[PDB]
Amino acid sequence: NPDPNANPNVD
């Protein structure tokens, strides 16, 4: 259940 604003394209 991640945050909808979070970007999955993390470093």
Epitope: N1, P2, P4, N5, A6, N7, P8, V10
Partner: antibody
């Protein structure tokens, strides 16, 4: 504005190889992940996986491990899909799609690339 | 498939149609990351609902989305001819993976 433009139709024999490209523009290529979706004849959309455009780590869904490779060339803001040892059941339209966030996945789509595999 | 949709739905012009989408596993978790897409032939899919109900700009306000339990639902009011298409629901299923539903063929009995 945002644009995903894929390469043209491909015709291949079984066992051959193919590499589909997905040129981007209108946004920083490395900020957003690139995803791949497949539609086989008379079937629905099937998520294949994505590649992290910052770390390069690819994620392949079960069913697209072993013969598929996601890659990108940041020099030209392009993502790539390569398939090895093509099988007839690979015949499908392959799409590339961007993911903006967990809440907004697949907000921009390529126009699709038809890959036909026939003997 | 991880998300079950009706194989087909038919409506006549002007009516409102509803398309369901049931989660077959708990991998969806909260089930709050649901998205819908309109797919016309020869063209690329188009995002029309994300986060269960959020409608983005550029998609008409005749499309709405709801949820009850583990069933996401897509309603199309004032059915038009250009609405005839394939419709898919999608959900995050943990560990940076997404899954689509089988799709529904919406027919506009016009």
């Amino acid at each position: 504005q945002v644009q995903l433009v894929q390469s043209g139709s491909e015709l291949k024999k079984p066992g051959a190889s193919v590499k589909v490209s997905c040129k981007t523009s209108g946004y920083t290529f490395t900020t957003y992940a690139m995803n791949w979706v497949r539609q086989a004849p008379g079937q629905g959309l099937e998520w294949m996986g994505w590649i992290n455009t910052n770390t390069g780590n690819p994620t392949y869904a079960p069913g697209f491990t072993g013969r598929f490779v996601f890659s990108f060339d940041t020099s030209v803001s392009t993502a790539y899909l390569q398939i090895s040892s093509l099988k007839a059941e690979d015949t499908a339209v392959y799409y590339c799609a961007r993911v903006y966030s967990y809440g907004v996945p697949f907000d921009y789509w390529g126009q699709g690339t038809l890959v036909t595999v026939s003997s | 498939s991880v998300l079950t949709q009706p194989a087909s739905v038919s409506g006549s012009p002007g009516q409102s149609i509803t398309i369901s989408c049931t989660a077959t596993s708990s991998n969806v978790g909260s089930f709050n990351l649901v998205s819908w897409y309109q797919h016309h032939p020869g063209k690329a899919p188009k995002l029309i609902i994300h986060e269960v109900s959020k409608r983005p700009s550029g998609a008409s306000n005749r499309f709405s989305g709801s949820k009850s339990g583990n069933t996401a639902s897509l309603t199309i009011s004032g059915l038009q001819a250009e609405d005839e298409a394939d419709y898919y629901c999608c959900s995050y299923v943990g560990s940076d993976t997404w899954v689509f539903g089988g799709g529904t063929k919406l027919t506009v009995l016009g």
